[PDB]
Amino acid sequence: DTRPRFLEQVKHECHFFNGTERVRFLDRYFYHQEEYVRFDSDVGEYRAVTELGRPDAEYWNSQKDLLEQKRAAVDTYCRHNYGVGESFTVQRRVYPEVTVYPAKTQPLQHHNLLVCSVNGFYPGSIEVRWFRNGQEEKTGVVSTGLIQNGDWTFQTLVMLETVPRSGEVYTCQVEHPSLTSPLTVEWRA
Amino acid sequence: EEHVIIQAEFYLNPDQSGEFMFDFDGDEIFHVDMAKKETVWRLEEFGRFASFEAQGALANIAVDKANLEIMTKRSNYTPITNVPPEVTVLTNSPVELREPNVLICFIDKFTPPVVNVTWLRNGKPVTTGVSETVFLPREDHLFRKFHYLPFLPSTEDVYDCRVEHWGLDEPLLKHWEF
């Protein structure tokens, strides 16, 4: 199939700062991936983003009942839906699961990577650090970044490039919004 | 900010595909099945505390289809440039042998939202217990998707996620083995 395609997207966005103390509502329209007209609650009217959306801003802004219902969306839509799902979205917190295991960069060679696998946590913001004999190791640390599993959990593999010697204690420290104290896991050769 | 709730919709010609879904901080809350006209919560626990009228969603898709035909005329029938995806294969949990796990195929940064993807075991296709999310919106206004495959890690088996897209000149295969 070689027929050309034509995509149209619409995104109704609610932005929240400090609970519902500050709310921003955006009503965005896209042709393919190019936004051409939007409504910004901080402006109170439709504004065309590209030349393509000028007919829409003119026509929509002439309707009084449309602008008024778009200006109340922060309360009739944004603040309403927040309280509906505030229990299982805003307050969802899943404890992370930390595993430390060794790996190899090239096969058939001794271990040279210490992998700290943090799994299944929510929310996404996380701080994972390595320590060697009590001193933090900030040199030669690679990671996968923060991975969204798509099922309302996250994971990240923070790897340490090092050849472990006997008598060395390596510690992976994990900080998370749902934790009261930093979670640490030791690993010794 | 602190949190973002996005109600994302799209309509695609000439495939006549549409979609209605709610997004929270990059995660799917629910999506409306356009066929059976039902609300599909991403996790079953969500439907207990909240309800959604699936009938209201189909109205926006009707307006979306009409708008698209207006914009297609305005753009003098300028088609969409296909953007090929990135593909990555990961496990949900660290691997142990004879310990159940889940493969995740992550298809990201592509448009239009049409894709053929298939799980392979040792070269043969698998459709057993396979699940997938619907097309999820991004903030550069491309798309991203997830495919899941529960499996038991063994030394004898080998897994690939093959993705097909109009922006790729060959079916992109992403490999996983223990």
């Binding site: 109704h12 026509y59 509906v84 | 709610f22 309800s51 959604f52 109205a59 307006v63 708008n67």
Partner: peptide
């Protein structure tokens, strides 16, 4: 207990 949708507008033909 019910989520509310926000309305898509119709462009001028």
């Amino acid at each position: 207990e019910t989520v509310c949708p926000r309305t898509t507008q119709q462009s001028p033909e």
